[PDB]
Design a protein around this ligand. Structure first.
Ligand SMILES: [Zn+2]
Ligand SMILES: [Zn+2]
Ligand SMILES: [Zn+2]
Ligand SMILES: [Zn+2]
Lengths: 364, 364
């Protein structure tokens, strides 16, 4: 069609930073077609305390009163089981996000995924509170010269056993392999979900971004704006990801990993910041894929039903009941997204035109 | 300190550009320890005419009177067998370089390597004139069907059947697979040379760069300064390249593919120029590798003997008979190479220490 009622859309992987960047980006969650956002915690310093996560949400709600914000802790050395219980009962967090140390933006305070044991008391506490464990599933790189090298291309596959071990050791814990990028990872998620049918059985899920449904290594090799973690991989991988996205299966749903960086932090000869900014046109990006796959009927599941179901989002939490209406009027993605002061963002697929727009409708 | 007499060193794959950039880099051939340079032709517009290649070489000779320059044409529809014969008879070129269109800097308007048939009159003339056919051996990327998709990691392997067919159809043509980056290509080169005894029988050879002896995908994921074509690939590829370089086989020799770009052309958020600048310390970079492999006794063959033998460089051509002497004095690579005007280049391994330096000694 033209005009599709997507209802209460979900983006379960959002970065909105702080300060002026946050003031620019947080209103764009709504503008991009997203009602519900799961907010990642890799701030400087990481979000590891109750007061910080409460005030952060306050800041976000003031900037965007109609957006529903689900918050998270950064899996940290500082964290204790005791704070996990406290934060959960105050409904101050919906999950804890794990960054392996050094693999991505603001991950230097993260963990070694070879030895998760020191966080098992944290994971047991999360398991009891029905909290979500989000994993940036990549092992840190190892060249070494004795055991198998780990690099940006196999670091996701090399993480898959750690995922299984965590799932085995905490079988009631809801776990997400965030932003999956490889056929290997799809197969592992498919397998873990062998005989779960109809949604409520899913304990381990994976989010898929907009940009990994378009990008391959060829697109970021010479183009830092398309460089993100985990890196876009081979055509065979993008094929597995697109097939999963339009599949209608409840263990794949949308998480943009929209990651804003000022343009000066992309135009570096070294230390290019990882991340693709997709917030401003999130749902229109995804619609393009589903149109091309002749599967617009599975769109509402991928960007709404499955994320709501897995995170158990209740209508009583929702900051606005407005529905996201996808309507097929052309727009051109600007070359830059700016606050008119010092922040310029290069948006994903800058300069390209999209077939779809999104507007907001009240429920009556 | 310890000293190694390398004789008349050869760098059979050099980019020196034009204008002020050329004035900066051309004297660095000498400074990096290289006596003989094979000059690539991908200028804007490419070198496809006799008068242009005559003038260019004179310009280089003016900038560096002690450096021996071997020149090339860019493989183009513009070329004719009559121009090949004329250019060779005037000793104006030693070879012709083929760029597949779109695969690297100033490579479109290059050729299609699902073809090469349209250039067979050129290859016949080259074969008759004892000219070398240099190949940037990567197939242009293809993601859509039918065929197995082509991307930056398999594009070299995907080129190897074009190499075999050319060698089959022109068994007396000297062909070089420039800057090999994959284990597959190394093996293909060895297999092609299965029945070769004595260096002079080699018809198909490969050059190896300095930087592909150090780099893997992780070194350029996020660091445009290490981004070049063909892209540095996996640890297994790096190991195979290092083994070939120290192998003592006459069909592998040094070609830096030193590719200078002003730093602002590397610090781009899109369209990063491909290329690593190694001219300023060319031979010391290689020495570091040969030392680490305990193969210094093979250094001279790789950077001198085998290139001279393959290109048949005669003492009567050599612009200076000074010998390159390696001496084991430690040095630090500067942060930038600059002309003190408008050009700064970030050199390969900027800031690192090298065990060896280079000096020049007169013969007799
Ligand atoms: Zn991540
Ligand atoms: Zn993220
Ligand atoms: Zn090349
Ligand atoms: Zn080159």
């Amino acid at each position: 069609v033209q005009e599709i009622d997507l209802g209460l859309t979900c983006d379960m992987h959002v970065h909105v930073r702080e300060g002026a960047m946050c003031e620019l980006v947080t209103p764009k969650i709504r503008d991009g077609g997203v009602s519900i956002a799961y907010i990642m915690p890799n701030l400087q310093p990481p979000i590891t305390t109750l007061d910080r996560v409460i005030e952060y949400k306050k800041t976000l709600q003031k900037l965007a009163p109609k957006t529903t914000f689900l918050m998270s802790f950064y899996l940290s050395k500082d964290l204790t089981p005791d704070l996990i219980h406290e934060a959960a009962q105050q409904h101050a967090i919906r999950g804890v996000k794990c960054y392996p140390a050094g693999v991505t933006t603001n991950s230097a305070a993260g963990v070694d995924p070879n030895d998760f044991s020191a966080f098992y008391p944290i994971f047991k506490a999360m398991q009891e509170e029905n909290l979500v464990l989000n994993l940036h599933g990549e092992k840190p790189s190892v060249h070494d010269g004795d055991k198998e090298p780990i690099h940006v291309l196999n670091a996701e596959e090399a993480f898959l056993p750690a995922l299984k071990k965590l799932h085995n050791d905490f079988p009631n814990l809801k776990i997400i392999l965030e932003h999956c990028t490889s056929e290997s990872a799809i197969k592992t998620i498919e397998d873990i979900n062998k005989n779960v049918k109809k949604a409520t059985d899913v304990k381990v899920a994976a989010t898929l971004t907009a940009h990994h449904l378009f990008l391959t290594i060829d697109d970021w090799a010479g183009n830092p704006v398309n460089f993100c973690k985990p890196v876009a991989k081979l055509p065979n991988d993008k094929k597995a990801l697109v097939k999963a996205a339009v599949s209608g299966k409840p263990y794949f749903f949308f998480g943009s990993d929209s990651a804003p960086h000022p343009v000066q932090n992309k135009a570096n000869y070294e230390g290019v910041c990882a991340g693709v900014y997709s917030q401003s046109f999130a749902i229109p990006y995804i619609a393009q894929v589903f149109e091309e796959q002749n599967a617009l009927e599975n769109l509402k599941g991928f960007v709404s039903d499955f994320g709501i179901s897995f995170y158990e989002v209740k209508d009583s939490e929702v900051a606005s009941s407005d529905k996201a209406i996808l309507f097929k009027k052309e727009q051109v993605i600007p070359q830059v997204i700016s606050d008119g002061k010092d922040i310029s963002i290069i948006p994903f697929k800058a300069g390209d035109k999209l077939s779809w727009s999104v507007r907001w409708e009240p429920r009556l």
